[PDB]
Amino acid sequence: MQIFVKTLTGKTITLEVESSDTIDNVKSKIQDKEGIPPDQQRLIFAGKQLEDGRTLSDYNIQKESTLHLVLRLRG
Amino acid sequence: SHMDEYQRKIAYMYDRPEMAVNDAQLQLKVSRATTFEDAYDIISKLSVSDMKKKLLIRFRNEDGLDYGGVSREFFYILSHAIFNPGYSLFEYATDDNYGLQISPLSSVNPDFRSYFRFVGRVMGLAIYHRRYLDVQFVLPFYKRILQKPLCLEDVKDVDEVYYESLKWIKNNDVDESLCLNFSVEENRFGESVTVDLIPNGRNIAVNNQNKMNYLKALTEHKLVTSTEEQFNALKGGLNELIPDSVLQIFNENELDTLLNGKRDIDVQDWKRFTDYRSYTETDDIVIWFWELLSEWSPEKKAKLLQFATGTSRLPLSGFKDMHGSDGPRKFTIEKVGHISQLPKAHTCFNRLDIPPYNSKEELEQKLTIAIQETAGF
Amino acid sequence: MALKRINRELADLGKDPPSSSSAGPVGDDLFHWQATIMGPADSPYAGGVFFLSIHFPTDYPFKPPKVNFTTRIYHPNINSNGSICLDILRDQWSPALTISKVLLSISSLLTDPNPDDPLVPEIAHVYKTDRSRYELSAREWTRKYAI
């Protein structure tokens, strides 16, 4: 499927993933696309923070789901 | 390639019949101590025909050969003098991001137009005689010189936090809780004065249907309207030598390269003006780090500088007057972390944490991998 | 915009104070505030009072205010000078935030220090390795200086 992630900078990114795909796979894809380390990525959907070791279907993520992504860096 | 195009443009520009130097030599003697005063006394009275002749510069009581080096040193000193913020002509865009821009307070002088025309003449003379300054303005300045439209994104090159706030206002809805309206409070020597972006703008709150006009007015006022007369005088002085039909074949980056040459970061100054925590100047890690920096390309040095200090720009006086988030803070190197971990950085403190590695090759590999994601220059 | 907002924030603080943290202008200068923060009960800084100096930039609310501690505090995110390395004041700042949210964030930081912004690497390492020693040192410093 296709999901949309909006960052703190307002950038909207489309990710081609599946509901059965794990959170680790999505974080790895995000790291490949933008270089954000999986540990520094925080994803929020429907008031729930995505955690490693689970899948998108575990968070009731559906077609064109809107997620909030925040990256931690700097100092 | 980009370099080939820039070289072709430079050759075409200097091949124009309207930018050819004469054969007579114009002497120009300035004392080293009073460079700014003598330079302003001489340059601000020369004619356009005189400024197009060969520039021969002799420092007083300093007799020597290789007049090219003497002229380059004179231009370096003059550029570091006229553009120095302490002279109340230009100013850094932000304390922790050193970007020169025309200071709005410079209007306090009875006649700033003469000084800014002199600055324009200096820039035009530097470009005309194939000599380089050593300053680093902001991109909106170069865009203004070339007469390009300025938009919201241009505020990113000036101030990051201001641009982020403006983008937040653009994206998210603005409610009545915020006391935002069409007015700006500018503090000039203690007293604060209110400037209205639009007529009777101090009594017009921003709704959800006006925030676009508010952002447009704020961007125009911050980038252009606050420095109209001064920049007009500066551009008149600049175009007194270089016709506007010549500057308009470059862009905001090729003009920067033409004005300041290829940008490089000095390593000796960096080593002389740094401090160590839990480290000594004779430690193996420190000397290996300095050797690696010595044998490195400018792009990767700029990447490391941005990774450590948070920005790739330096103050007008090197690493001596280096500022942090709070105040002055020189580049700091500290021993922190386990051996396997990558080197870390603290940008708001200008700090670099390097674990105590065992071999120089491992240090180089870890440092390169750590600075990979940073984009410099 | 840089004065109406400050007046609104001061009026709101004067209407419904948090009853723990206080803020107010020093003398008559709206661009320089002093704030008082009470030590959280569930933290080693319990029973202490801390003073903060807040400078509002002329670009407010587009630029965050500068907050500096005055009383010395043994914390893994506050250096000896007093600078606070807080995310809400450098990265995640937005015009919607007020000056009370900053005080609440600082009071919450005094409860759970963030080891991912180690402004003081030594104290951060002690906190991450030996919690008891860090807590004892924090309590000793609070007793010595905060009171």
What is the count of structural domains for chain A? 1
> What are the two backbone dihedrals, phi and then psi, of residue B355, each rounded to the nearest 5 degrees?
-65, 155
Q: Chain B residue closest to C95 (CA)?
A: B165
- Supply B300's token pair: 């990767």
Residue from the list C3, C5, C64 with its beta carbon closest to the beta carbon of B161: C64
Alpha-carbon distance of B351 to B98, in angstroms, equals 18
- Residue contact B349–A10, C-beta within 8 A: no
The DSSP-derived string for A42-57 is EEEETTEE--TT-BTG
Calculate helix-pair angle for C121-129, C131-141, nearest 10 degrees.
130
Number of H helices and E strands in chain B, helices first, is 16, 10
Alpha-carbon distance of C59 to C2, in angstroms, equals 7
- Contact indicator for B274, B331 with CB cutoff of 8 Å: yes
- Contact indicator for C73, C140 with CB cutoff of 8 Å: no
- Measured between alpha carbons, how far is residue B26 from residues A54, A75, B135, C63 in Å? 77, 53, 26, 50
Q: Identify whether B348 is a catalytic site residue.
A: yes
Give the other-Cβ count within 10 Å of B127's Cβ.
21
> What are the two backbone dihedrals, phi and then psi, of residue B25, each rounded to the nearest 5 degrees?
-105, 130
| Domain extent for A17 | 2-71
Closest CA to B84 of B38, B132, B133: B133
Give the other-Cβ count within 10 Å of C67's Cβ.
20
Q: Which 3 state secondary structure label does DSSP give B17?
A: helix
- Supply B251's token pair: 């862009």
Chain gaps in chain B, named by the residue before each (C–N > 2.5 Å): none
Closest CA to B202 of B217, B220, B185, B224: B185
- Contact indicator for B154, B140 with CB cutoff of 8 Å: yes
Interface size between A and B, measured as CB pairs under 8 A:
14
Alpha-carbon distance of B41 to B249, in angstroms, equals 33
Q: Which 3 state secondary structure label does DSSP give B90?
A: strand
Q: Which 3 state secondary structure label does DSSP give C117?
A: coil
- Contact indicator for B74, B30 with CB cutoff of 8 Å: yes
How many CA atoms does the CB half-sphere of B274 hold within 13 Å? Answer: 24
Alpha-carbon distance of B333 to B319, in angstroms, equals 14
H or E segment and range at residue B106: none
Report which residue type is found at C10. L
Q: Which 3 state secondary structure label does DSSP give B108?
A: helix
- Residue contact A10–B171, C-beta within 8 A: yes
Residue from the list A10, A35, A75 with its beta carbon closest to the beta carbon of B348: A75
- Residue contact B167–A10, C-beta within 8 A: yes
3-state helix, strand, coil in chain B (%, to 5): 50, 15, 40
3-state secondary structure B161-174: HHHHHHHHHHHCCC
Alpha-carbon distance of B336 to B355, in angstroms, equals 5
For residue B140, cis peptide bond before it (omega within 30 degrees of 0) = no
Alpha-carbon distance of B313 to B94, in angstroms, equals 11
- Supply B155's token pair: 């505020």
Alpha-carbon distance of B242 to B235, in angstroms, equals 10
Closest CA to C109 of C43, C24, C19: C43
C32-46 burial string, b = 16+ CB within 10 Å, else e? ebebebbbbeebbbe
Query: What's the DSSP call for residue C143?
Result: I
Closest CA to B120 of B249, B232, B19, B244: B232
- Contact indicator for B362, B355 with CB cutoff of 8 Å: no
CA angle C106, C108, C113 (to 5 degrees): 90
Region of residue A74 (left: phi > 0; alpha: psi -120 to 50; beta: else)? left
A35 Cβ contact partners less than 8 Å away, ≥ 6 residues apart: B373
Q: In what order do the strands lie in the sheet with B344-346?
A: B274-277, B331-334, B351-353, B344-346
- Contact indicator for C43, C111 with CB cutoff of 8 Å: yes
CA distance to partner chain B, nearest, from residue C5 (Å): 5
Same fold, B2-148+227-260 and B152-223: no
Number of H helices and E strands in chain A, helices first, is 1, 5
Cross-strand partners of A68 = A6, A44
Closest CA to B82 of B48, B46, B38: B38
Task: Cite the beta strand spans of chain C per DSSP E.
Answer: 22-25, 32-38, 49-55, 66-69
Task: Cite the beta strand spans of B83-213 per DSSP E.
Answer: 90-92, 100-102, 183-188, 191-196
Q: Which 3 state secondary structure label does DSSP give C44?
A: coil
A74 contacts on C by Cβ (under 8 Å)? 90-91
CA angle B189, B158, B165 (to 5 degrees): 90
Question: How long a stretch of residues is chain A?
Answer: 75
**Can you tell me which residue has the tokens 């137009």?**
B113
User: Nominal resolution in Å?
Assistant: 3.3
| Chain C interface includes B336 (CB < 8 A) | yes
- Measured between alpha carbons, how far is residue B224 from residues B145, B165, B264, B267 in Å? 11, 19, 30, 36
| Radius of gyration, CA atoms only, chain B | 24
Strands B100-102 and B90-92: antiparallel
Report which residue type is found at B23. D
- Domain B2-148+227-260 is found in CATH 3.90.1750.10: yes
B241 Cβ contact partners less than 8 Å away, ≥ 6 residues apart: B48, B51, B52, B121, B124, B125, B128
> What are the two backbone dihedrals, phi and then psi, of residue A23, each rounded to the nearest 5 degrees?
-65, -35
Residue A67, domain CATH: 3.10.20.90
B217 Cβ contact partners less than 8 Å away, ≥ 6 residues apart: B182, B197, B198
- Contact indicator for B25, B248 with CB cutoff of 8 Å: no
Alpha-carbon distance of B169 to C94, in angstroms, equals 9
**Can you tell me which residue has the tokens 């030996």?**
C130
- Measured between alpha carbons, how far is residue C25 from residues C7, C38, C70 in Å? 11, 18, 16
Q: Chain B residue closest to C96 (CA)?
A: B178
**Can you tell me which residue has the tokens 């125009």?**
B220
CA distance to partner chain B, nearest, from residue C13 (Å): 14
Q: Which 3 state secondary structure label does DSSP give A8?
A: coil
Q: What is the dihedral of CA B299, B301, B307, B311, to 10 degrees?
A: -80
Alpha-carbon distance of A36 to B290, in angstroms, equals 29
| Radius of gyration, CA atoms only, chain C | 16
Q: Chain B residue closest to C55 (CA)?
A: B326
Alpha-carbon distance of B213 to B206, in angstroms, equals 9
- Measured between alpha carbons, how far is residue C127 from residues B218, B262, B352, C120 in Å? 46, 47, 21, 11
- Contact indicator for C85, C73 with CB cutoff of 8 Å: no
Give the other-Cβ count within 10 Å of C14's Cβ.
10
Cross-strand partners of B90 = B102
Residue from the list C58, C63, C68 with its beta carbon closest to the beta carbon of B186: C58
- Domain B268-371 is found in CATH 3.20.20.150: no
What domains sit in chain C, N to C, each tagged with a CATH number? 4-146 (3.10.110.10)
Q: What is the dihedral of CA B196, B201, B207, B208, to 10 degrees?
A: -50
Q: Chain C residue closest to B278 (CA)?
A: C122
Report which residue type is found at B204. I
Alpha-carbon distance of C33 to C25, in angstroms, equals 4
> What are the two backbone dihedrals, phi and then psi, of residue A15, each rounded to the nearest 5 degrees?
-115, 130
- Supply C124's token pair: 């951060």
Domain boundaries, chain B: 2-148+227-260, 152-223, 268-371
Give the other-Cβ count within 10 Å of B106's Cβ.
18
- Measured between alpha carbons, how far is residue B62 from residues B32, B58, B75, B334 in Å? 9, 7, 16, 44
Alpha-carbon distance of B161 to C66, in angstroms, equals 13
What is the CATH code for B152-223? 3.30.2160.10
